[PDB]
Amino acid sequence: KVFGRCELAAAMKRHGLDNYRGYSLGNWVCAAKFESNFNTQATNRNTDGSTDYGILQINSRWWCNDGRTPGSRNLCNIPCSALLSSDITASVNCAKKIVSDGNGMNAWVAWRNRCKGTDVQAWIRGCRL
């Protein structure tokens, strides 16, 4: 599913991400924009043999099982395919674990490089929330 901007903001808010660990909703929408272009089905292979999955490009080296990443830990206890669903629950629940693990949203390269320190609330402006 390719979400609209405000549609995703609303779904992320319903699933508890607005100000989760102090990160306002615009941070999450901005991260999803530049990780996946709001596309739940996005996948990308990494140099190390892992793959990133879903709207927040969650990586199979630590967070989910894809059956082909040697040494993976599956800390979200889910198949990586669950992160491609039109239902964002699994991606949100796993993202909550990631962002709570010590480095906050710096876990997401696109967030660090394209969202952090910018006017992220622009990503939710004009939305019914």
In the chain, how many domains are there? 1
Is 7 annotated in the active site? no
Out of 7, 18, 48, 52, the active site residue is 52
Amino acid at 70: P
> What is the residue range of 86's domain?
1-129
The answer to whether residues 91 and 83 touch, using CB atoms and an 8 Å cutoff, is yes
The side-by-side arrangement of strands in the sheet containing 51-53 is 43-45, 51-53, 58-59
CATH of residue 42? 1.10.530.10
66 is in an annotated binding site: no
Q: Which of 35, 48, 66, 119 is catalytic?
A: 35
Beta-strand relationship, 58-59 and 43-45: unpaired
What is the experimental resolution, given in Å to one decimal place?
Answer: 1.2
DSSP secondary structure letter of residue 78: S
Q: How far apart (Å, rounded) are the C-alpha atoms in residues 32 and 3?
A: 10
* Catalytic annotation present for 35: yes
Joined tokens for residue 49: 């043999």
Assigned token pair, 64: 């989910």
